[PDB]
Design an enzyme around this catalytic site. Structure first.
Site, PDB file in Angstrom:
ATOM      1  N   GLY A   1       0.830  -1.208   0.000  1.00  0.00           N
ATOM      2  CA  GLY A   1       0.000   0.000   0.000  1.00  0.00           C
ATOM      3  C   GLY A   1       0.852   1.239   0.000  1.00  0.00           C
TER       4      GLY A   1
ATOM      5  N   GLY B   1       4.144   6.481   3.528  1.00  0.00           N
ATOM      6  CA  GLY B   1       5.192   6.087   2.605  1.00  0.00           C
ATOM      7  C   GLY B   1       4.708   5.024   1.626  1.00  0.00           C
ATOM      8  N   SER B   2       5.636   4.164   1.213  1.00  0.00           N
ATOM      9  CA  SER B   2       5.361   3.094   0.265  1.00  0.00           C
ATOM     10  C   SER B   2       5.803   1.794   0.905  1.00  0.00           C
ATOM     11  CB  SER B   2       6.087   3.338  -1.057  1.00  0.00           C
ATOM     12  OG  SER B   2       5.598   4.521  -1.668  1.00  0.00           O
TER      13      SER B   2
ATOM     14  N   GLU C   1       7.831  -6.193  10.960  1.00  0.00           N
ATOM     15  CA  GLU C   1       7.286  -7.559  10.960  1.00  0.00           C
ATOM     16  C   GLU C   1       5.997  -7.553  10.147  1.00  0.00           C
ATOM     17  OE1 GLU C   1       6.102  -8.805  14.927  1.00  0.00           O
ATOM     18  OE2 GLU C   1       5.493  -6.794  15.334  1.00  0.00           O
TER      19      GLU C   1
ATOM     20  N   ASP D   1      -2.207   8.696  16.198  1.00  0.00           N
ATOM     21  CA  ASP D   1      -3.018   8.339  15.034  1.00  0.00           C
ATOM     22  C   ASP D   1      -3.663   6.978  15.256  1.00  0.00           C
ATOM     23  OD1 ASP D   1      -4.177   8.956  12.536  1.00  0.00           O
ATOM     24  OD2 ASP D   1      -2.400   8.246  11.430  1.00  0.00           O
TER      25      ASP D   1
END
Length: 273
Positions: free
Chosen positions: A13, A18-19, A89, A135
């Site tokens: 995702g 980020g990526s 992980e 968050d």
């Protein structure tokens, strides 16, 4: 050399975090997640005990890193010319709480109790390690479906826990408390409890309670599904407009609705298998 120790796989995702690519540790076929973050998009930096300048997210993950499965474990990190790469992980099979609630709708109260309890244990763990997540929401909670265990992820909006006021915030607006919307001030623990009320409502109603600022500030809770009176009371208690009038983690975990939680493995066998 991240490319020699880890084998990269399909993009899982991408977003404000980020990526994130799926991957695997060659040393032992362990399922990892490989997260890239561009340096120029990092706005908060910290320092390791070593004294070296990393993204705040690395600092916070190391502080909470432990065998306790309630929080994601950082297994390694690497600095590159224009980005940092984090090896985390990856439970397998896994589904995040947002997708889980989307697929199934509102959760039975027995299952939300178990999920909510594990989220609270995970958040207490962060605070006890000096870390404020900032968050807490369904998208940032992973369900280890074999074991029935939840995992808190994405610390990229977090901060060192402190007792003085926060005047900056880069988390999710619809999970942020009224004092942030109106005054751009909040304190760590009370803000966290607000977002936990939002999450618990989301679990038992299948959607979040507030969408616009005026709704957050008004704080009127309407239940769109059948929810027990004790669970409504815990939710309304967590969403109290005055931060001080919100219940402490001890008060939430001693609440009548929170009694007799299922163990994780029971949770998986009854509700996940």
């Amino acid at each position: 050399p991240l490319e020699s120790q880890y084998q990269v796989g399909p993009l899982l995702g991408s977003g404000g975090f980020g990526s994130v690519y799926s991957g695997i540790r060659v040393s032992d076929n362990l399922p990892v997640a490989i997260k890239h973050v561009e340096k120029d998009r990092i706005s908060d930096w910290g320092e390791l005990p070593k004294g070296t300048r990393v993204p705040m997210e690395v600092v916070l993950l190391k502080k909470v890193s432990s065998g306790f499965s309630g929080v994601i474990r950082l297994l390694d990190w690497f600095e590159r010319p224009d980005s940092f790469v984090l090896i985390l992980e990856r439970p397998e099979p896994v589904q995040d709480l947002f997708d889980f609630i989307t697929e199934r709708g509102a959760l039975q109260e027995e299952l939300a109790r178990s999920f909510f309890w594990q989220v609270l244990e995970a958040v207490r763990h962060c605070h006890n390690c000096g870390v404020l997540h900032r968050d807490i929401k369904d998208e940032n909670i992973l369900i280890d479906l074999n074991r029935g265990e939840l995992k808190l992820i994405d610390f990229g909006s977090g901060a060192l826990l402190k007792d003085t006021v926060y005047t900056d915030f880069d988390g999710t607006r619809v999970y942020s408390p009224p004092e942030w919307i109106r005054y751009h001030r909040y304190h760590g623990r009370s803000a966290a409890v607000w977002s936990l009320g939002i999450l618990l409502y989301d679990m038992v109603c299948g959607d979040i309670p507030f969408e616009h600022d005026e709704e957050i500030i008004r704080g009127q809770v309407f239940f769109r599904q059948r929810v027990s009176s004790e669970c409504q009371h815990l939710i309304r208690w967590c969403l109290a407009l005055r931060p001080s009038d919100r219940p402490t983690f001890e008060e939430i975990q001693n609440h009548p609705w929170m009694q007799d939680v299922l163990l994780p493995q029971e949770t998986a066998e009854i509700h996940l298998h």
